[PDB]
């Protein structure tokens, strides 16, 4: 059986079908993914200019779908016709994503003030100074351009982006665990749910949450020299003792206790369910599956960070080419030729290549997250006696 799908729901249903099937009682996160995959893809990458233009083109296609119904699409156009709603939602999310990134039309733009971020004091001192720049005013709608888009601000900004992606992956894992718990409640197991899902969930969740809370505490304390590597430095010693950099006064003993708790819970993820089954009367796949899934979530976060960095680099390259064309063209013709060439190249790179790569990566991350979460394939589609030509 299949849940009824509207015009917008059809793409999510198709995605769920790609991720195998699920039982009628089995939870189907397809509706949730219909926003999550746009939510992740927006976090993954996005260009404000072409993305808005791509969204406008998709909306025009949706408006003209009446003719597109008559005019049979070809190859990827057919898939686009079905996925118009999902693409529009993804572009809408990417709009806010670019707003956060502040690279409007793949270029930083001032927000509210004449300059969104500036350098307080150091009037004569160069940007490469001890005082350097002070952001007395910070951009309220997006990252401060001085602190992010500037020449030397790139490394710290990238580290912060990677750290945030780690937290986003932790949140995705938590959502998967929550979905698993909900589906188990739907499965209505008297004690098997507590014996199996509760230990499999929560354990790795808190394992990653320790690092996420460490990141939050670092953001509160604002340590500088370690940059985003303070967490790496802290976790570098799984053994006890030391822990000088620990922001929480008791973070060391608490971390040791948490490590012991995780070590104890590790068999609890695998042992209770087969024991209950034997008492009534796979786990081997579940073995190492938790570590593999945590590694996969970290990989997804790193992939998102890398995709964002690559998008920023491509935007910088396009802006540099445009600036070079404009500055070195006293005559109108040279500037026009350069602008046209740069526009064509940037469109091809971003709207096609970068967009497809980001979509594929986001889809793969979504499949990994869903497979970790639930629904384990194992089903088929609703089978009516519908006339294919008529319907």
């Amino acid at each position: 059986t299949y849940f009824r799908t509207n015009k917008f729901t059809s793409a999510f249903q198709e995605i769920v079908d790609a991720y195998g099937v699920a039982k009628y009682r089995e939870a189907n996160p397809g509706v949730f993914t219909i926003v999550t995959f746009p939510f992740l893809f927006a976090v993954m990458f996005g260009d404000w200019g072409h993305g808005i233009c791509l969204l406008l083109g998709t909306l025009v296609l949706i408006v003209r779908e009446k003719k597109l119904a008559s005019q049979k699409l070809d190859d990827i156009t057919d898939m686009t016709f079905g996925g118009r709603y999902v693409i529009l939602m993804m572009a809408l999310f990417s709009i806010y994503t670019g707003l956060i990134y502040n690279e409007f039309f793949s270029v930083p733009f001032e927000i509210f003030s004449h300059s969104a971020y500036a350098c307080r004091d150091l009037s004569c001192s160069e940007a490469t100074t001890v005082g350097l720049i002070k952001v007395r005013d910070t951009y309220p709608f997006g990252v401060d351009p001085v602190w992010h888009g500037s020449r030397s601000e790139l490394p710290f900004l990238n580290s912060l982006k990677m750290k945030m992606s780690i937290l986003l992956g932790v949140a995705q894992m938590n959502l998967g665990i929550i979905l698993s718990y909900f589906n188990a409640t739907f499965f209505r197991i008297g004690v098997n749910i507590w014996c199996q899902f509760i230990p499999q969930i929560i354990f790795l969740n808190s394992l990653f949450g320790y690092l996420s809370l460490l990141i939050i505490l670092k953001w509160i304390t604002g340590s500088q020299a370690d940059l985003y590597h303070v967490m790496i430095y802290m976790f570098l010693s799984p053994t006890d003792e030391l822990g000088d950099n620990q922001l929480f006064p008791g973070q060391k003993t608490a971390q040791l206790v948490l490590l012991l708790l995780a070590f104890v819970s590790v068999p609890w993820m695998l042992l209770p369910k087969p024991f209950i089954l034997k008492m009534q009367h796979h786990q081997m796949i579940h073995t190492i599956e938790f570590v593999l899934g945590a590694v996969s979530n970290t990989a997804s976060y790193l992939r998102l960070w890398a995709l964002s960095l690559a998008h920023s680099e491509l935007s910088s390259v396009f802006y540099e080419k445009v600036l070079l064309l404009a500055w070195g063209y006293n005559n109108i013709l040279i500037l026009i030729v350069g602008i046209i060439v740069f526009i064509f190249a940037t469109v091809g790179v971003l709207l096609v290549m970068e967009t497809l790569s980001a979509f594929l990566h986001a889809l793969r991350l979504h499949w990994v997250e869903f497979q970790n979460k639930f629904y384990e394939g194992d089903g088929y589609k609703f089978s009516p006696f519908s006339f294919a030509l008529l319907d």
Binding site: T1, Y24, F382, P384, F385, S386, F387, L390, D391
Partner: peptide, 27 residues
């Protein structure tokens, strides 16, 4: 939220029901 169904329908009437359910149908 579906379930199996079983029925016995005369062939002559079954033709009309099948024709009606051809486009979309249930089972």
């Amino acid at each position: 939220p579906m379930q199996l169904v079983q029925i016995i329908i005369p062939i002559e009437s079954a033709h009309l029901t099948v024709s009606y359910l051809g486009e979309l149908g249930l089972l």
